[PDB]
Amino acid sequence: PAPAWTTFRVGLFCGIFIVLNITLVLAAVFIWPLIRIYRGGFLLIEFLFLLGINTYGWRQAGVNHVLIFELNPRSNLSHQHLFEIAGFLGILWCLSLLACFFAPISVIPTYVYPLALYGFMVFFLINPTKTFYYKSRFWLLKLLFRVFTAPFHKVGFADFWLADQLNSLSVILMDLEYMICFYSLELESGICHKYTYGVRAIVQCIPAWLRFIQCLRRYRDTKRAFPHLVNAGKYSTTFFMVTFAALYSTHKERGHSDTMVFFYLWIVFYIISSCYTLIWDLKMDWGLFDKNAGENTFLREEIVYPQKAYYYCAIIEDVILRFAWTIQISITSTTLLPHSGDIIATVFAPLEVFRRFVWNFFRLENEHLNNCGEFRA
Amino acid sequence: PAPAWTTFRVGLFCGIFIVLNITLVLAAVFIWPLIRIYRGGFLLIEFLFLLGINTYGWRQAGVNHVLIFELNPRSNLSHQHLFEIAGFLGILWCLSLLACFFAPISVIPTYVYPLALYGFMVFFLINPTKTFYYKSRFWLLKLLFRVFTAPFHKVGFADFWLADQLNSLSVILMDLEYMICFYSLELESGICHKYTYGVRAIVQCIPAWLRFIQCLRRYRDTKRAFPHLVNAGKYSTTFFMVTFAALYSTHKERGHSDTMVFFYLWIVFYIISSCYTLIWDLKMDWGLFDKNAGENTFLREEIVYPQKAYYYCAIIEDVILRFAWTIQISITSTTLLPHSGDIIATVFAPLEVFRRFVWNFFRLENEHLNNCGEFRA
Ligand SMILES: CCCCC/C=C\C/C=C\CCCCCCCC(=O)O[C@H](COC(=O)CCCCCCCCCCCCCCC)COP(=O)([O-])OCC[N+](C)(C)C
Ligand SMILES: CCCCC/C=C\C/C=C\CCCCCCCC(=O)O[C@H](COC(=O)CCCCCCCCCCCCCCC)COP(=O)([O-])OCC[N+](C)(C)C
Ligand SMILES: CC(C)CCC[C@@H](C)[C@H]1CC[C@H]2[C@@H]3CC=C4C[C@@H](O)CC[C@]4(C)[C@H]3CC[C@]12C
Ligand SMILES: CC(C)CCC[C@@H](C)[C@H]1CC[C@H]2[C@@H]3CC=C4C[C@@H](O)CC[C@]4(C)[C@H]3CC[C@]12C
């Protein structure tokens, strides 16, 4: 059981966060792209909350997520701790947004509030002192370093899972790159969003690149072509989508008679990527639609979770949100729809986070039931 | 141990209450005497919070408050439950005050909000359904009924303790009387606050009358003059103070050439009442300044609380706040200081509540250590 003080802190943070959200909504209804700046922080807070929910559900369902992630049996971060961290970060995020909205102090400008929020987040993650979740934070930092140096390090379940999360959090990297461009040029006024370039596509594909190189490393280590090269192609579909969209946009800016062929290539490879990722998540990562399953239709014969309706709704939402996520990657990597691109990305990113949350649920359950990832011996 | 959900609710209520207080302060810095209307609710919430703290401290110190109050051992109200109730009531109070400040709904008039808040509080206290700590609420209702009908019922420790709480919460009754007068006449400008009447003075003396009649009944039952008649005189001192203050102000309104005589008599009786109450609290209720104590100076021989500095600070604060409370009674019951009387009473009432909180601490401690109250055989 979590400490009573931990529960009190979680409740206090949740209440303050709720009232801060209400105040922000009231201020909204009653110089900087604040939406893009704060999208990353909001997505991180939502991901932390959904991670706490994932931990609670795994504990309730009996899934041995601790063993899969190779976490210390003696000390395990509770879902309440994740909720507390998410609530505190959300409170700080809301306070920064309110300060931007109202500008309480004339001497203090607006950019310093988001700058301090993100800087405090980074410092808290890498806080040298052993004060607030130091063990878990150091483990997460090691995992992040391993994931980024994917080819050099052997791929474990934790590395692959974190790389998948990054794939679901590419919006943060996109927003950071856009902010860098805005500072470099804007601060034509809208040159950054008016024109798309290759480095933007590279930043979009970075998570997929990490996953693809991890798959190549796993193929080299295990020498099994089917389990790993197919996943590598699944991740390469994303690169093909991104570069084809970028070419289509570039030739839209200046027609070379190849705009239409690039449009067709982008559409076909977008459909291919959506189908590939959806099928991999539905069959390989989840294990559903198993032949052995006779009691549960379209599911696997053993289902740890209580309701099959959970699995069915997960399938439907996974399909819809996979198509939505590929659409969002296309919109964010390249201009495409300029006027509504930012709005589409903002609406879609939380949906992608929720989809990855459900996917984490079901993938961890399947891995507990069967060694789908083959990480274990 | 309190339920985890109870702790989460306590934290959520505390956070919402804190943010609502911040919003109220910011609105204040940026027809109805709202101060008088809401002082009673604020004092009630503060008393509930301090009572929860008292219960926690009694549990920590080993004081058998359950046995002293003759409460059911199996079923008890944890300090966390009191904190939750206080937080919810404070949230409702803050929402009502904010609604009054902003008048969010044009159709709804201002007077509805405080009326709705107080009606909801009363209904919650007298809720017939078996919900929201129904057993404790019924016990409290029975205790209040017995306390008000003091002479007819034999005095127990709980009755005397609740009567003392009422003595420390006479400001609520004073505010209710002032509101009744305001509705009767105002709804001459400021007629009620400009002048004082005998009914106001009588209302000021209601808790003291209850305590005095309880002491008389205890004297009749026990037949011991010293333990009860001395306390009866202690409670008569406040009657004399209030009566002489009212008489002096009445003579000030209509000169009789004896106003100075009444002023001197009121001052003398105020000093008498302050000294009587302070001496009774320090020597009898707390049992300090005992000759038996060899290792403790100015304190009783046996102390359960970890620090004697607590006892010394309690002595000092009681000394100051008894005079402060007598001044508050004199100012509120009468028109002694019409210009600043309301502010003085508003500042002093929380101080009186805090004094009663410390007094509850030490009185329960002394009763557990020694049967000073003589309520046990
Ligand atoms: C694109 C931008 C960045 C995207 C987001 C990046 C990273 C976050 C993603 C995942 C975090 C890990 C979630 C848990 C997964 C394993 C299951 C589990 O629940 O295991 C947890 C692992 O706890 C964790 O790892 C910590 C959870 C996350 C805490 C968040 C820290 C603050 C971050 C601030 C923002 C940072 C970025 C700056 C702002 C831009 C069990 O904890 P333990 O203490 O037993 O850990 C093991 C420790 N031993 C082995 C020594 C005992
Ligand atoms: C102007 C007048 C304002 C209203 C009156 C003032 C104060 C009311 C609050 C508290 C006084 C009683 C404190 C007793 C302490 C004993 C030690 C202990 O803490 O032990 C607790 C006492 O619990 C209580 O009785 C409840 C304490 C109060 C809880 C809050 C209820 C709502 C109050 C709302 C007031 C609304 C007023 C509106 C304006 C008029 C043990 O709990 P149990 O569950 O064993 O209770 C006994 C139940 N058996 C016997 C069946 C086991
Ligand atoms: C609104 C629709 C489209 C979204 C898809 C349905 C959502 C609500 C479903 C998909 C998977 C479901 C989760 C699957 C497993 C668990 C673990 C269990 O111990 C508690 C419920 C919980 C946490 C479920 C909550 C509901 C859930 C998140
Ligand atoms: C006004 C100045 C000079 C003195 C103020 C002293 C106050 C703050 C002192 C007087 C009695 C003290 C309390 C006495 C007993 C306890 C119980 C213990 O388990 C926790 C601390 C607690 C609750 C103390 C907190 C501090 C306290 C309330």
Swiss-Prot record, chains A, B:
The annotated consequence of R200A reads: Decreases phosphate efflux
Residue ranges annotated as transmembrane are 2-30, 31-62, 76-103, 110-131, 155-187, 188-223, 225-255, 259-286, 306-337, 340-377
- Outcome, altering R211C: In IBGC6; phosphate efflux is decreased; present at the plasma membrane
Instruction: Quote the tissue specificity entry.
Output: Widely expressed. Detected in spleen, lymph node, thymus, leukocytes, bone marrow, heart, kidney, pancreas and skeletal muscle.
Its GO CC terms are: plasma membrane
Q: What is this protein called?
A: Solute carrier family 53 member 1
State which disorder the record connects to this protein. Basal ganglia calcification, idiopathic, 6: A form of basal ganglia calcification, an autosomal dominant condition characterized by symmetric calcification in the basal ganglia and other brain regions. Affected individuals can either be asymptomatic or show a wide spectrum of neuropsychiatric symptoms, including parkinsonism, dystonia, tremor, ataxia, dementia, psychosis, seizures, and chronic headache. Serum levels of calcium, phosphate, alkaline phosphatase and parathyroid hormone are normal.
Annotated site residues (Gating residue for phosphate transport) in this chain: W325
Species for this entry: Homo sapiens
Interval of the full protein contained in this chain: 228 to 625 of 696
Q: State if Protein transport is listed as a keyword.
A: no
Protein's GO biological process? cellular response to phosphate starvation; intracellular phosphate ion homeostasis; phosphate ion transmembrane transport; phosphate ion transport; response to virus
Q: Which residues form the signal peptide?
A: none
Member of which family? Belongs to the SYG1 (TC 2.A.94) family.
Q: Report the gene name.
A: XPR1
